[PDB]
Amino acid sequence: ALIVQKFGGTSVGTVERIQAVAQRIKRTVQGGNSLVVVVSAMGKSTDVLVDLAQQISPNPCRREMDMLLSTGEQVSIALLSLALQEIDQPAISLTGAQVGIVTELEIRPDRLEHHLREGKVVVVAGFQGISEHLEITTLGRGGSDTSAVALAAALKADFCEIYTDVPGILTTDPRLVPEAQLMAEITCDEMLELASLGAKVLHPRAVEIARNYGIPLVVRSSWSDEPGTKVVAPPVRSLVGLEIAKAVDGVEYDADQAKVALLRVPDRPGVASKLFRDIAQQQVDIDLIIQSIHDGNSNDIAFTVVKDLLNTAEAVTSAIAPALRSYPEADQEAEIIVEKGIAKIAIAGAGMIGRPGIAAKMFKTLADVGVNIEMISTSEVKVSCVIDQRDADRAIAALSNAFGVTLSPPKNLPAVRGVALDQDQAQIAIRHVPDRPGMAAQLFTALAEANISVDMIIQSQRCRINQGTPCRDIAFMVAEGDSSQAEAILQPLIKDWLDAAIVVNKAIAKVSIVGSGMIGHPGVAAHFFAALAQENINIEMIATSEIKISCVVPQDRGVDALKAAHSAFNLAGTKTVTVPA
Amino acid sequence: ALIVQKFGGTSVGTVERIQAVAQRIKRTVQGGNSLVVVVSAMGKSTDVLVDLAQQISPNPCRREMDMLLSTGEQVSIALLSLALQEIDQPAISLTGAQVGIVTEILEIRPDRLEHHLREGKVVVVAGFQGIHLEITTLGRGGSDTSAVALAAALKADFCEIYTDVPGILTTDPRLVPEAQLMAEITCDEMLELASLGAKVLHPRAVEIARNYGIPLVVRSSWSDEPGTKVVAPPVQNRSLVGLEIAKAVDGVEYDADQAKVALLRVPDRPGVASKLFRDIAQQQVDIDLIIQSIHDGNSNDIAFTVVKDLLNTAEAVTSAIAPALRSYPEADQEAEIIVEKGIAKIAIAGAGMIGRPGIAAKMFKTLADVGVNIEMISTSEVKVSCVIDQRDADRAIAALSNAFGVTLSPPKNQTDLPAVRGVALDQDQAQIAIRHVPDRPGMAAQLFTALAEANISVDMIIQSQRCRINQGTPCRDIAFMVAEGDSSQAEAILQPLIKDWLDAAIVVNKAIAKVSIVGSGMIGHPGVAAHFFAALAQENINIEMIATSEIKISCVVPQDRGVDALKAAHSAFNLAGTKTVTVPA
Ligand SMILES: N[C@@H](CCCC[NH3+])C(=O)O
Ligand SMILES: N[C@@H](CCCC[NH3+])C(=O)O
Ligand SMILES: N[C@@H](CCCC[NH3+])C(=O)O
Ligand SMILES: N[C@@H](CCCC[NH3+])C(=O)O
Numbered sequence A: 001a002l003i004v005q006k007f008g009g010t011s012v013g014t015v016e017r018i019q020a021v022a023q024r025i026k027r028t029v030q031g032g033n034s035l036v037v038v039v040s041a042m043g044k045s046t047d048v049l050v051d052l053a054q055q056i057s058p059n060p061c062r063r064e065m066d067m068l069l070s071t072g073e074q075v076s077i078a079l080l081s082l083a084l085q086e087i088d089q090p091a092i093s094l095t096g097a098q099v100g101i102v103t104e105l106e107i108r109p110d111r112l113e114h115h116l117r118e119g120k121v122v123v124v125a126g127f128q129g130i131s132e133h134l135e136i137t138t139l140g141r142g143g144s145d146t147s148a149v150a151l152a153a154a155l156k157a158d159f160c161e162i163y164t165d166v167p168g169i170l171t172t173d174p175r176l177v178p179e180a181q182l183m184a185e186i187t188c189d190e191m192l193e194l195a196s197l198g199a200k201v202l203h204p205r206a207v208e209i210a211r212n213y214g215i216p217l218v219v220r221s222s223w224s225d226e227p228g229t230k231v232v233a234p235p236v237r238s239l240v241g242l243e244i245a246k247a248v249d250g251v252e253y254d255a256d257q258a259k260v261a262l263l264r265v266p267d268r269p270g271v272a273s274k275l276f277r278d279i280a281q282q283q284v285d286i287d288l289i290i291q292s293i294h295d296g297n298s299n300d301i302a303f304t305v306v307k308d309l310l311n312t313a314e315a316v317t318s319a320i321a322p323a324l325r326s327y328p329e330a331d332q333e334a335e336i337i338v339e340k341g342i343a344k345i346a347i348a349g350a351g352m353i354g355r356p357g358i359a360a361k362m363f364k365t366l367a368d369v370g371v372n373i374e375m376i377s378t379s380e381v382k383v384s385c386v387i388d389q390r391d392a393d394r395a396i397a398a399l400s401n402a403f404g405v406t407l408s409p410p411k412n413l414p415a416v417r418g419v420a421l422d423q424d425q426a427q428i429a430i431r432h433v434p435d436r437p438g439m440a441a442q443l444f445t446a447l448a449e450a451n452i453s454v455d456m457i458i459q460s461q462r463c464r465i466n467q468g469t470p471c472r473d474i475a476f477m478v479a480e481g482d483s484s485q486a487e488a489i490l491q492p493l494i495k496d497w498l499d500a501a502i503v504v505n506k507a508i509a510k511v512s513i514v515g516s517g518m519i520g521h522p523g524v525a526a527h528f529f530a531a532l533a534q535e536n537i538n539i540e541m542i543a544t545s546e547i548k549i550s551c552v553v554p555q556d557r558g559v560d561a562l563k564a565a566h567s568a569f570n571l572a573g574t575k576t577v578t579v580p581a
Numbered sequence B: 001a002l003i004v005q006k007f008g009g010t011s012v013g014t015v016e017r018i019q020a021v022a023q024r025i026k027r028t029v030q031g032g033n034s035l036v037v038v039v040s041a042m043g044k045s046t047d048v049l050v051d052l053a054q055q056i057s058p059n060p061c062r063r064e065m066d067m068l069l070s071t072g073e074q075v076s077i078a079l080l081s082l083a084l085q086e087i088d089q090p091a092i093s094l095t096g097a098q099v100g101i102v103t104e105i106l107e108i109r110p111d112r113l114e115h116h117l118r119e120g121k122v123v124v125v126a127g128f129q130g131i132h133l134e135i136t137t138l139g140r141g142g143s144d145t146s147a148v149a150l151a152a153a154l155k156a157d158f159c160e161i162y163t164d165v166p167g168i169l170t171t172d173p174r175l176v177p178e179a180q181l182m183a184e185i186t187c188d189e190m191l192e193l194a195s196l197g198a199k200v201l202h203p204r205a206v207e208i209a210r211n212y213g214i215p216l217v218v219r220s221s222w223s224d225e226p227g228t229k230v231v232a233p234p235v236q237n238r239s240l241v242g243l244e245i246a247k248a249v250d251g252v253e254y255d256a257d258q259a260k261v262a263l264l265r266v267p268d269r270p271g272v273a274s275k276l277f278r279d280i281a282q283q284q285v286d287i288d289l290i291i292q293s294i295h296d297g298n299s300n301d302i303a304f305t306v307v308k309d310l311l312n313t314a315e316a317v318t319s320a321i322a323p324a325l326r327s328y329p330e331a332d333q334e335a336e337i338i339v340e341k342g343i344a345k346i347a348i349a350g351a352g353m354i355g356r357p358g359i360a361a362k363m364f365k366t367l368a369d370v371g372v373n374i375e376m377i378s379t380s381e382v383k384v385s386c387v388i389d390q391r392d393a394d395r396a397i398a399a400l401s402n403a404f405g406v407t408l409s410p411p412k413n414q415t416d417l418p419a420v421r422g423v424a425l426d427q428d429q430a431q432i433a434i435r436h437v438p439d440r441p442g443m444a445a446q447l448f449t450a451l452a453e454a455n456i457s458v459d460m461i462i463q464s465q466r467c468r469i470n471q472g473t474p475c476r477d478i479a480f481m482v483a484e485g486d487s488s489q490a491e492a493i494l495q496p497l498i499k500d501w502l503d504a505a506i507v508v509n510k511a512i513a514k515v516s517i518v519g520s521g522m523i524g525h526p527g528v529a530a531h532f533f534a535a536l537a538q539e540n541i542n543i544e545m546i547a548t549s550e551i552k553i554s555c556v557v558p559q560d561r562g563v564d565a566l567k568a569a570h571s572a573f574n575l576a577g578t579k580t581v582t583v584p585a
């Protein structure tokens, strides 16, 4: 019944189109539904507005600017509601304080449209803002999506539909893999980790709000009546006080963790494949998998398991190891170590995507409370850290306070839902970071103060040092554009770290698989790694969350690796054929 | 100090121009002034918005329309206040409920969060809250009206309307190149000469200014010239409580010091009216109403009013000129004089009646419903005047006062101010006369109600004497004017209604022009009408109809002579700026 629909610019770019949506809305109502409609400004209309302002002053006072940009939807909802009224659909345009209030940023809807709900389709645009004071403003770039979800939440809508010039979410980038299939369903969490698959179609903060208030979502197309892609949430009631610019949505803590690491394994295709294949044959489910930058002609591989599986996991690992040695008698190779007294902590949040200083503030918070960071693993929306279990209590209190959030559960359908590829990034590693509190904080604070956002951070074992104090290598990734400046920022800071060094490698690609089904499902990572080895593709780095695995890989092989992952998990799906005679 | 400025679309059509006004505003502030600025949507930007709405519904719900149209105004004040800030002029954009509230007749009321922001900043405003709608505009001429209403509420020293025009001219330059730029014009004059301000300012706003004593100025943006000052009576200690912004009628008027002289069955040829009023003026007899409806055969009547105490003088003089208008001085059936002492003049007055249907009709219905018969009728641009039996005056005034929700206006003082301020011509009109309307209450009501229910707006209505007829029930001819486009439909509407009036008939004449002179100075100034009529006769121009208010005289005239008549009027009153002799080059 109660459905919130939103329509983007293009869907409304011409008067003709406006009449079409109006048609669908009517049809929807006549289905037995009540409709709240959010509309974006018409099209390049917004672009022309900003153009104009730019020829008047370089820096536009923000309020005068929010008023200017606010006129767009003001007209779009006027047009649409007229169009509805022409075809005898009772409608009405609500604006500003009639719909809600933004405070600065904190949004809160009301219900003069709960009223107007009787007969009419309520078409909405704008909230009232306070600081001077503005009568109508928008929430910004991705405001349309967010407003819609926030509204569905406030009204207890049955679901929320986002209409666009796209049938839904694909399994990957069609431009590289034509066999990319249209997803019927995807989880909020998956959608967040695969943000890029929704780049120009919907905004991560809105799918996160939907997840948090149990609002069913649907990415559909306007030029079609196809089902589209359902964005699915946990079944979750009334909450009103929405922070819309939070970098971090939640903090996480899992004490049921134990580390197995294989040290100094050969750095060649097939190694990781074999390791995890054998482990999965024991039906051993895995959590973290961390592999940072190579050390000479070899690397380490670390993973975590539930505490009571550590013994099993160590024994199995200890037995594969000799099969991993370049040559039988290489006792210096494939050496195994084990660590039982660890905890995993994380910060999670859609608001960290593309935003600087988030990881850095996590590290500072821990450093300020004296807790050393042992390992580090990023996904799209999580930064995970492994710490001494004894530090856990003060560590997550600190993170809880610093980020203003409550705790999500420690741990919460197919193994893989979609796969993705990033080839615009540069790897930068800082060799030999002293393994003591505050080091990562100081390196990543520096980058963040220069407005450089970081995409990946990977930190694994202590360096095999001849002598000096313990230290670890830290690898991270940034846009190739930021490569040079990043190096230039960090070089000073390591000047007097024994044997420290900065090395950049531009020729890398990142291949990722995402899937909620991989939790408590042994052999997912193994299948992924095997897929890359069968193509003789070397895995330079690995980083994980519970539902995302990323492998760093040679740039000249990113596409090949994407296709392999796509096929390994069957993203193209299955066609069928007339077998004759 | 406290100045409200308004800038129209064209003045703001381009970013470059926006920067220019911003410059002037800054200069104005540095002058030692506080500034409230009203701005219109950018250009044809608001037509553009309508082309879009139209495409969806040629019957656009007005609530949605107001919001829609409001957006062009919003972008403009944002731009302008940024432009001011770029040249270090503290400014700020106010909108909707921060400025005021419109309730829906439609009732506007400003506030003063800008009395506050007044400290340092030029406040640039757009929109009011509608009672709901968060931001809406007042409509087409809303910008002008908002500005004046604001100046009233803030006790502004004056209010300036900026536009792509130096001010108000004495007439239409397209017909009379020697048209001069007015330095000063009165609100009342500006109202009667509405057409001279057609595309530059809105009558409703000049009327608000007059009523709250707000000095006005029509100037140009591409210039620093003084412009045209629109002058009001000094009105002190009236507070702008609120404001009805869509009233058709501003006021009711009543004048009992009236007496009629009529010359009946005079020859219908050039020179007649000229001679009548010339001689009357030689006695220094000031005239009020002059009414001449449609011809009857080859002749017409001429009626005028005069103060009661002057009736005797006026009758005698008229009785003496008359024989000179005949075949032989002692001819019978020619130029006979009658006189009527027990009359009153009542009127409804209001800028809101310009171009709007049903107003005259509602006046006539109100009088009819209260049983009072209408004897004569005369329209100006903003007044419809009726002559009635003096005994009917009390019930007539009360009825009009109630029906239009206004109070009897007070008589005005005395002056002298030039006789004529400007002149104008309308040649897009058609004359339509309805012969032999039964002279009983409700007849005019029913004819004009019919036209108004079809959305036809009427420009002029003239009604004079009873028709000369042997036996039978008394009757008068009624002439009126409408846009030629409405000619046919008008005739078509009325034909049914007269089908059982003895000898009634409808006749249309499309080939007419209307020439008007306007001037506050013509009040208590004998010989103004005479000079006007003499001017047309000297050009051998026949006067088909005449209609009057205290400060406007209109003559209906043959269409192929409108321009000639306009030139004659402009020259007759030395509106060029001196006298002219055109000599051999
Ligand atoms: N971009 C964040 C970290 C996000 C990591 C997840 N991919 C920062 O620069 O602090
Ligand atoms: N639990 C899955 C995925 C582990 C890697 C991602 N957390 C497996 O055992 O392969
Ligand atoms: N009072 C002037 C003008 C009369 C026509 C307009 N009321 C006159 O006697 O000439
Ligand atoms: N236009 C009005 C009459 C106004 C008086 C004409 N100057 C109507 O049709 O009711």
Ligand SMILES: C[C@@H](O)[C@H](N)C(=O)O
Binding pocket: A265, A266, A267, A268, A269, A270, A271, A272, A273, A291, A298, A299, A300, A301, A537, A538, A539, A540
């Ligand atoms: C280090 C190990 O993961 C190796 N690069 C592989 O591809 O298997």
Ligand SMILES: C[C@@H](O)[C@H](N)C(=O)O
Binding pocket: A371, A372, A373, A374, A433, A434, A435, A436, A437, A438, A439, A440, A441, A459, A472, A474
């Ligand atoms: C992260 C690691 O290099 C170090 N132990 C730290 O806490 O900063």
Ligand SMILES: C[C@@H](O)[C@H](N)C(=O)O
Binding pocket: B266, B267, B268, B269, B270, B271, B272, B273, B274, B292, B300, B301, B541, B542, B543, B544
């Ligand atoms: C009747 C009178 O108006 C005459 N037609 C004139 O022009 O003088």
Ligand SMILES: C[C@@H](O)[C@H](N)C(=O)O
Binding pocket: B368, B372, B373, B374, B375, B437, B438, B439, B440, B441, B442, B443, B444, B445, B463, B476, B478
């Ligand atoms: C002729 C017309 O004016 C009529 N006397 C009436 O009062 O309606």
